[PDB]
Design a protein around this motif. Sequence first.
Motif: not given
Lengths: 224, 224
Positions: B82-90, B191-199
């Motif tokens: 979504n583009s408020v919770p910034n959820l599922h940023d992949i 192993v790739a565990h994360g992707i840089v999303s936000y802060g």
Amino acid sequence: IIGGVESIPHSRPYMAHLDIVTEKGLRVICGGFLISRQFVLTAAHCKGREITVILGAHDVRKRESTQQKIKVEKQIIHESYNSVPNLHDIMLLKLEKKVELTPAVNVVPLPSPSDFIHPGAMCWAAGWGKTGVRDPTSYTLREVELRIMDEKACVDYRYYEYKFQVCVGSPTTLRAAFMGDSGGPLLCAGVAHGIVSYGHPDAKPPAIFTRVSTYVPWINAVIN
Amino acid sequence: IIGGVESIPHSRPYMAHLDIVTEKGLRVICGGFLISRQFVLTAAHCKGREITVILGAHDVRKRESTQQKIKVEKQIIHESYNSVPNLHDIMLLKLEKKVELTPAVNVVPLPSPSDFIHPGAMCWAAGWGKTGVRDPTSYTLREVELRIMDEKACVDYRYYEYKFQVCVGSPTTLRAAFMGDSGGPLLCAGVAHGIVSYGHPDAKPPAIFTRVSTYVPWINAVIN
């Protein structure tokens, strides 16, 4: 540059591509023009934290053997540059070194303070700016032939200040300078008569150019 | 990357540098990582009109022997981004071509859907983004060691959603992934565990990375 053509590589050897780091660490571009072995003219709105000047380019993505990359010592902003009327949008850059004057990297003539450019002339503007209102900046130098307008074309039909500012571009064509073109020259019979300053968000002609003629005495006083 | 170091050149062969034309004709960067010969992983917020991926790079401003520049055919953003919770940023990038796997360009493993990363693991994040809140993006790849946090560190101390997101970075250091590092890998144990999303806009830890583990069953259904 909107509506124009790719330049011939190296045929505008005064052209300065500016790499600017802004105060909040943004990389931005502007244009400029070499008027002495040490001084680049551009628009005061091309201010930054740090500026690197690239001279001798066509394609700034490529490491062309003509290119001369110099840092800026000084940014000399017009002392009456207001930052709302957009008035006095002119800045000198002092370079860290002198350039080596070469066929690909050389100076442009400036007018005489008595030279005024009339409405109806057709001039050339060049830059590495956006080629569209929603199209990105160019990696290669582009050029466009533009017509000098009457004061009526920008005043009662918009905005302005005539002694200081040129009104450039006929609303009969989407030919324009745009974002990233700023501080580029306007050449009229090969003389630097204008600097790209500002316009309409939609790039619709006419646009405002600083009037080099007016500031020649400022330019000589600072440079000398 | 804030508070990190240059990587050793070519030592992270999975790393993708993304060159993005936004819908308003702006050039932005992001990171990403090669998961197969035709697919790159990155953040959904790194969507653009047009994506060019550069593999095999260290200094993206040099034309290095090892580089492969490929255009993206498809941009496949997770169906619930979504583009408020910034959820599922992949996001999956389907490449135009398959890449050639070389010493400098090769794939990073993905976790198994049962592989959670614990709080307290030490991980590495790499990127070409800003090296300070007001400092410019980096031309050569940088990396930083970051500490995986307990949920508490991002919930009652701010924001969050634990199933899909990791909290990363202790408030003990100013080490952080920043602007331009988005879409880059968080490497834990190979192993790739994360992707840089936000802060946080001050880039003060902790920050939020997409939890890769959780999205594997989506990744395999899209790619395979």
